[PDB]
Amino acid sequence: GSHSMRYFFTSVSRPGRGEPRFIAVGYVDDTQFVRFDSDAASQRMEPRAPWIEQEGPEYWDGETRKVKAHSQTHRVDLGTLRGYYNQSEAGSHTVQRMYGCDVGSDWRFLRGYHQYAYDGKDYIALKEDLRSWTAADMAAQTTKHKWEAAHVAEQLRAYLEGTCVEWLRRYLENGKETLQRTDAPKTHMTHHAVSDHEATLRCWALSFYPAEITLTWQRDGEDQTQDTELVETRPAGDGTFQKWAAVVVPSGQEQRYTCHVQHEGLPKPLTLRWEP
């Protein structure tokens, strides 16, 4: 299928004392593989998947140097932004950045992105052409004009189209045993008497990867939305995901209802029915 490499960066200013807290994490698809935390003792980029551990010392050195450079850029930006928004030095503020690349099922470049937020709202983003920027407000507009004049996008474009893809492909192959494996949902149904006249059926999808999944209930072969509940997809902690969906039904009518499960790991969708 398609794949992506994405890096996420957060920097939170600390007005009482010291420098901004900075946290960076890197993902391939739904798998975290590296982290940096400015408050950790190591002051190094750290592995978070086994397959990255085979990278040699020059890798770790270079990623550490780069991530620390990123932390400084975010520090400077927090200053610039407090000035653009005419904010006092007293409050804590946040910058967030995400960049990366997607490839298609042929592992060739599909799209690149580079987005920035301030205090949890869009600030500036690279357009899909990778040559110009979209600014959300008049402060970001000043950034857009500066970056366009300076051709900030051209080295970034070359990274997103070239370097990013080359690394993503390297990781996919070195991480093959997990990154190229789908884990189909392990499914089951539970039944819970609510009263003498109504029951809850809960359809479970467990231990799947990647996280994208669809669970739908049908009654006599038509989609049912009322009297249902769905939870957000949640991490199990072991790199896989969980979800459930439930429906409330008249006792004795359980067999009318089917739960339908769609996932990349399933060549055909699964249908579950309470007929135990």
Binding site: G26, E63, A69, H70, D77, T80, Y99, A150, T163, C164
Partner: peptide
């Protein structure tokens, strides 16, 4: 692998 040089605002 990270991008080598993110520019400031």
């Amino acid at each position: 692998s990270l991008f080598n040089t993110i520019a400031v605002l």
